[PDB]
Amino acid sequence: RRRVVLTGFGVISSIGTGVEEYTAGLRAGRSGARPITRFDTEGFGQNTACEVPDFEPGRWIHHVPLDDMGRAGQYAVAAARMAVDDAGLTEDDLGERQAVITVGTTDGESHDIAVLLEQELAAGDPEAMDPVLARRINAGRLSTVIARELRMPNVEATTVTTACAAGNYSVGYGLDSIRSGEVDIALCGGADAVCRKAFALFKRFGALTPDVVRPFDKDRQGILTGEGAGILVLESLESALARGARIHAEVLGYGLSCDAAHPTAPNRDGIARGIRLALDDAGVEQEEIDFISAHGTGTKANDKTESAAIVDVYGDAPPRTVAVKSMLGHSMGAASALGAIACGLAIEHGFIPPTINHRETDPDCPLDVVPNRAVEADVRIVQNNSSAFAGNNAVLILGTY
């Protein structure tokens, strides 16, 4: 069966833009938490999220007019340009090449949907709504604008809408697409943008922390909303070696499971099945996993249930289990993509990113979460977990090349 490698990473995150800044943020245990600037927070009783602080779209986007995209599309396109540059691929290298472009999202341009609704409400008239926003709100656009920016017409542009697991589904679809032999390159990841919809949703669910995100902490109080984009360049090994690509890591396998249970609660059995399916697809045993990048949102329900699924599969000897969302907050569809890139960098650079804001591990999560500071480690094989509303689970296994 065909080997698939990661040749390029593109990162727009609350802790760093670009591979070098993101690597430094992960190693340093940087927090992405800062005041919300995207929308009016009056009445929420809190105003912290993990926004991208200094986004300069002009620095990455050349061809697609900016008003053709909301912030989520701009993040996806900027990260895809950074990824192809990190892969040493030019627009000319990409042009002809049959490709899959797959972007995961939870909310897409839900900020623009809110702005359209403000226009209707202020006017009392739906005719006041801006056609420029209306034209860019559909999730399918997040994948097509990358093909437009990169001048790639021979593209399957699929936006995967599996909410908080979407990045891992996208990377997996790229793996399956290249393994099929039908393409030798896929641009895969996830993108979302901070918005009133996500902030209000998590607040009303009682899932927002009043202060900081403490995954697996005994006194954890929930999440901060985040945003950004991670785009990964997947290539057949044959194609990467033929053009002398630098390989960050190998994609070994993934697993998809559905809880078929509840529309918002996590499920121990569904998460455990996703993990086992991923290990089977990757052809690896539990004992070979150096650490797990947990979905690890810092809610009471998520971390208890995910720990129990991990303890279940790994038989009371789990590996180090860390929560990148401690640093990033919850970047929704992007979370698992930024997690996958963190895992690839951990493999390449021999370090485990920390679970920050950690005071005391929940006794019911008997895990080494690598609290507060990164450690150096011989990192060869890494599991990246994701779970979502509607019972959707996706687990990704990356290895050393």
């Binding site: 009056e42 009445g43 999202t105 839900s110 949907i113 809110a114 359209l116 609704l117 403000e118 209707e120 409400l121 739906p126 709504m129 801006d130 056609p131 709100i137 559909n138 999730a139 399918g140 656009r141 994948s143 097509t144 093909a147 437009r148 790639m152 017409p153 593209v155 399957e156 542009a157 699929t158 936006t159 995967v160 809408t161 599996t162 909410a163 589904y169 679809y173 399956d176 393994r179 009133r196 919809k197 209000a200 949703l201 607040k203 009303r204 669910f205 998809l256 499971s257 559905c258 809880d259 078929a260 529309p263 918002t264 569904g270 099945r273 979502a388 509303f389 509607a390 019972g391 959707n392």
Partner: protein
Amino acid sequence: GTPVITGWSAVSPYGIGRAEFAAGVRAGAKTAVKADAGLGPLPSSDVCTVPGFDIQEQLGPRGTAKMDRLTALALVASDGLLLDADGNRAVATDELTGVVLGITMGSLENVTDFLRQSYTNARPFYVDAGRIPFGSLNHAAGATAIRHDLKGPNTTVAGGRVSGLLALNYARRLMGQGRATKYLVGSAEEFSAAHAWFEHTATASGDPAPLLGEGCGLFLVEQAEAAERPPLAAVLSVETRVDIDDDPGAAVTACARRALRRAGVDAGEVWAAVPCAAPTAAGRAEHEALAALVPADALSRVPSMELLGDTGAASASFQIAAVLAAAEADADSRGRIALVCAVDRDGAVAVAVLRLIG
């Protein structure tokens, strides 16, 4: 290992079920009705809604009071696909049965009702909390899995008019990698006031307020060698492009020529060709591209869908369903080629090539 479609179902402006859909297509039935005053002001009073569709009447009293129409449309279609007319189990499923649904942007009714409550209630998270689960873009696909106990792969893809064909290709690839032995594949779009106003806003300056439809088409997909039922059609190819030069005619032509080449067939073999017939310049360009590429008799083989109105993400699924309904009605369809294509406003173009069997 060619994927075969072994079953289908539809909830459409023709009514509930594949038999209603088949009859309406064959009849060229009109589906446009005056909108319920309950929907409130609309850009057009004419709509192509699913007739006699009440969520609680169809699905019962449990978890249905706050359910989005999109989810309800997918669940009723899933019953049509997996159950017979009396609720008996017609299709055996297991943990290797995948689900993939194509959408535009989920329930715009749910997200706009939520945000409207955010803007207008005493505090900006004082919303209907019971509607929150139904808002997720993947809710319809997840609800289908809860309903039929489908623990296997569960995926939702966007892409609007091409979403049914992106779903089909996604299923084809994951089946080829052994992630599933069977798949429920299709696409769905609800009618909503929010969707109708967003479409009116997005359409080219002074275009007429479009006639909008709704519904869900679903297919049962199996590997040819392992099929537990007679194949209705083999999926020979699904090819995609992005129209980066805003030339949808050229993008359709290039996509269809590649899909036919990958299928190993000449354009002259095409027996039925069904384009998405978007009520746009891109839709007319798609029609003219096909009218030059395939035999003229292929374009008139399948009655026009135009009286369903614009069915958004349901489009390509309804197009495949029309092809299967035509094939079933014509013994001469056996071993012939069908082509389905669609163009989405966001730039994606997709073409599927089927060998009809039956």
